[PDB]
Amino acid sequence: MGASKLRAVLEKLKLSRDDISTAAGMVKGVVDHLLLRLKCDSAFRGVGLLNTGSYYEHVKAPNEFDVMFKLEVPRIQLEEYSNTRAYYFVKFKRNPKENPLSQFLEGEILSASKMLSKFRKIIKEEINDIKDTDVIMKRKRGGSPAVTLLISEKISVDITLALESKSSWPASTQEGLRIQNWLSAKVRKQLRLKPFYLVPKHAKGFQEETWRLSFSHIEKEILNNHGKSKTCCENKEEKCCRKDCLKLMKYLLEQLKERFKDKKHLDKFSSYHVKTAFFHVCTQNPQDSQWDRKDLGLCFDNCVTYFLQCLRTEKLENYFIPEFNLFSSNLIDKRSKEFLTKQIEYERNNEFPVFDE
Numbered sequence: 316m317g318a319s320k321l322r323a324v325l326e327k328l329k330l331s332r333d334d335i336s337t338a339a340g341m342v343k344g345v346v347d348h349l350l351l352r353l354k355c356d357s358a359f360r361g362v363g364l365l366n367t368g369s370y371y372e373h374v375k376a377p378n379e380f381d382v383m384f385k386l387e388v389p390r391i392q393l394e395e396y397s398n399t400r401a402y403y404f405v406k407f408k409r410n411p412k413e414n415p416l417s418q419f420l421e422g423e424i425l426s427a428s429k430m431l432s433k434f435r436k437i438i439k440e441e442i443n444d445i446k447d448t449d450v451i452m453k454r455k456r457g458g459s460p461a462v463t464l465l466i467s468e469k470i471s472v473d474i475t476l477a478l479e480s481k482s483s484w485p486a487s488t489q490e491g492l493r494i495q496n497w498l499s500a501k502v503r504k505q506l507r508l509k510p511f512y513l514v515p516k517h518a519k520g521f522q523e524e525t526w527r528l529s530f531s532h533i534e535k536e537i538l539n540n541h542g543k544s545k546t547c548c549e550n551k552e553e554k555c556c557r558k559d560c561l562k563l564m565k566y567l568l569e570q571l572k573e574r575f576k577d578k579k580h581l582d583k584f585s586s587y588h589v590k591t592a593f594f595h596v597c598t599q600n601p602q603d604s605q606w607d608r609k610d611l612g613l614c615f616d617n618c619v620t621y622f623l624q625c626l627r628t629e630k631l632e633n634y635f636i637p638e639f640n641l642f643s644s645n646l647i648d649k650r651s652k653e654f655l656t657k658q659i660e661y662e663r664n665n666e667f668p669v670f671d672e
């Protein structure tokens with residue numbers, strides 16, 4: 316596939332400045348309201364907005380947003396569940412002390428379901444009272460930590476609540492973030508000093524009171540500063556195609572998901588898998604020269620091939636948690652991965668007709 320053929324698709328995916336300004340304004344307009352009204356509680360007092368991009372995550376629809384609500388918790392003690400390296404129980408070291416979130420304490424373990432229930436209920440009751448904009452609160456999805464709302468029957472916003480921990484990263488993430496050859500071990504050192512987050516997600520019956528590790532902020536960090544050279548993409552001679560490869564991959568997965576929307580094979584595949592795979596390829600190809608713009612197509616293929624391999628071998632390690640396989644037999648069944656593999660292979664073999672619209 317030609318580089319200009321791909322960059323043409325990327326060119327057509329570009330949304331104008333107005334489409335960003337108006338939608339962004341309509342989003343922040345409700346985000347500020349919900350944010351300020353959430354402060355009217357002892358629990359969600361120190362709530363805050365976390366920058367997980369503050370824009371859209373999927374290229375095509377640009378009417379879908381994703382915001383993350385951070386809530387700091389002091390000196391928490393985590394307890395890994397069932398040797399699932401990603402999922403944890405939240406306990407407090409100072410149990411004798413009275414906690415603001417004490418109402419949600421399921422004993423010594425902080426219940427995620429209660430917090431999600433109160434949070435979501437507050438959102439529903441506030442979305443009821445707003446009159447300046449037409450907003451409806453979307454139905455609860457299957458085991459989703461998010462709360463979605465629709466503004467003016469066109470804008471989708473997924474609000475995800477998350478606990479913040481300034482303490483050192485868990486031992487499961489120790490051998491993760493292998494960016495030493497890519498962004499230097501210094502940057503890894505300084506990045507691991509940053510806080511980590513926790514989202515209310517249950518692990519497989521289901522253990523409904525567990526939390527998942529989240530490093531979305533770090534993903535944004537390495538994503539916006541992606542080159543081995545510090546002046547990468549700041550000058551003409553240092554333009555690369557990492558972000559373009561990520562856009563192309565995400566768009567391919569999205570379009571494939573939409574083509575077979577009627578089926579249920581690709582419903583479990585999300586942009587996070589694509590992101591993860593892309594990070595793995597970045598680790599594999601750390602040199603900026605390996606990401607020359609004129610090599611876009613080739614680069615894209617590298618992102619495709621590897622991804623296919625992960626589907627073929629049923630192995631896709633979480634970039635921060637190596638021992639956690641996103642493509643395990645438990646999470647996603649072989650049949651679906653075979654389907655996606657066949658589709659992607661077809662696309663590549665026929666010059667990606669899914670891009671042509």
Ligand SMILES: O=c1nc[nH]c2c1ncn2[C@@H]1O[C@@H]2COP(=O)(O)O[C@H]3[C@@H](O)[C@H](n4cnc5c(=O)nc[nH]c54)O[C@@H]3COP(=O)(O)O[C@H]2[C@H]1O
Binds near residue numbers: 459514
């Ligand atoms: O950490 C977060 N930061 C911002 N929003 C988040 C986060 N976690 C959840 N959500 C919000 O809830 C939606 C559904 O979540 P679900 O737990 O059911 O499945 C996730 C999950 O399997 C995987 N995923 C996504 N983020 C991570 C990660 O940080 N660490 C490990 N896995 C991850 O993608 C799938 C869906 O991707 P989407 O983003 O489309 O839709 C999310 C999102 O809206």
Ligand SMILES: [Zn+2]
Binds near residue numbers: 547548554556557
């Ligand atoms: Zn670059």
